[PDB]
């Protein structure tokens, strides 16, 4: 129905034009999106690219006073970029630490960390506690260091 | 050409502060100039390196660290460190800062002072170079609050670009 073809070959140009062939397409919702996109790596390897590959990980920031609080955002700090930075890297920021959650970071304050665990020992899917330095350092690799180190 | 000041007590009249300005050119080495004040009557005094040098025979011990005890002492005014009580007679002109460390005293110095016949001059200059300081540190103050707004200013429009160029 669109511009491109069965039987012949097609080539960057071409996928272009029959791109721009095409008006618009808004009929799906973003989990939907997501899902597919996470689909396709599976069926395909596609979690070799420098970026996306923290896709199949939820992330979680302290930007909060309190702990699943939405009224006490701690805007105007180094964490709120770092958060934006891993939203950059297909990582999906949750603003509530649901069970679900797979990553969670934690700035140069640590007063919390014990209530993290205990959540964590809660929770029958255990999430690792990671520290701010990690993926900063991790973004010149542009690949999953081990958390390990920085348990 | 930089001095100081500081206020000390006096055992005598513990009740009443005095104040001490010191006042050297490049470094206490050379010498400095003193003077001792309380609103009424004031008295001066001068070191050269010899008087510091001749003190540091009679203690035997590093010069430098005498000049830093000396600088701590007359400058910083820290208390927590090892607090230590300045004594005067001024009939017999004798302001001598004794050293109480726990259970052991030490002599620190010894000094002589003259009665300036216009205490008038001194205290009026003390003053008039602090309100000197007061109105320059006002001034680089505001200038410092400027330069903070403009820095928060361009913190807000990198954060701004940062999230736009993501989102897009």
């Known amino acids: 129905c669109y511009g491109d073809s069965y039987f012949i070959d097609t080539d960057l140009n071409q996928l272009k034009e029959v791109f721009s062939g095409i008006k618009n397409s808004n009929e799906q919702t973003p989990e939907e999106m997501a899902s597919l996109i996470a689909d396709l790596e599976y069926r395909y390897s596609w979690d070799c690219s420098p970026l996306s590959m923290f896709r199949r990980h939820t992330v979680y920031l302290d930007s909060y006073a309190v702990i699943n609080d939405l009224s006490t955002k701690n805007e105007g700090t180094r964490l709120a970029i770092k958060a934006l930075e891993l939203r950059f890297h297909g990582a999906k920021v949750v603003s509530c630490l649901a069970e679900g959650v797979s990553h969670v970071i934690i700035g140069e304050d640590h007063s919390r960390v014990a209530d993290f665990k205990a959540f964590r020992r809660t929770f029958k899917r255990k999430f690792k506690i990671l520290k701010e330095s990690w993926v900063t350092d991790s973004i010149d690799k542009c690949e999953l260091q081990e958390e390990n180190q920085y348990l | ?168």
């Open chain 2, 1 to 168: 050409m930089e001095r100081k000041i500081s206020r000390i007590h006096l055992v005598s009249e513990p009740s009443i502060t005095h104040f001490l300005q010191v006042s050297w050119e490049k470094t206490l080495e050379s010498g400095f100039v003193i003077t001792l004040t309380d609103g009424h009557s004031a008295w001066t005094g001068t070191v050269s390196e010899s008087e510091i040098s001749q003190e540091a025979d009679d203690m035997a011990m590093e010069k430098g660290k005498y000049v830093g005890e000396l600088r701590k002492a007359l400058l910083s005014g820290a208390g927590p460190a090892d607090v230590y009580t300045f004594n005067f007679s001024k009939e017999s002109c004798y302001f001598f800062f004794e050293k109480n460390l726990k259970d052991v005293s030490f002599r620190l110095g010894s000094f002589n002072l003259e009665k300036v016949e216009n205490p008038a001059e001194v205290i009026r200059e003390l003053i008039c170079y602090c309100l000197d300081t007061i109105a320059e540190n006002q001034a680089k103050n505001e200038h410092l609050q400027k330069e903070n707004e403009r820095l928060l200013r361009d913190w807000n429009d990198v954060q701004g670009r940062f999230e736009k160029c993501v989102s897009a």
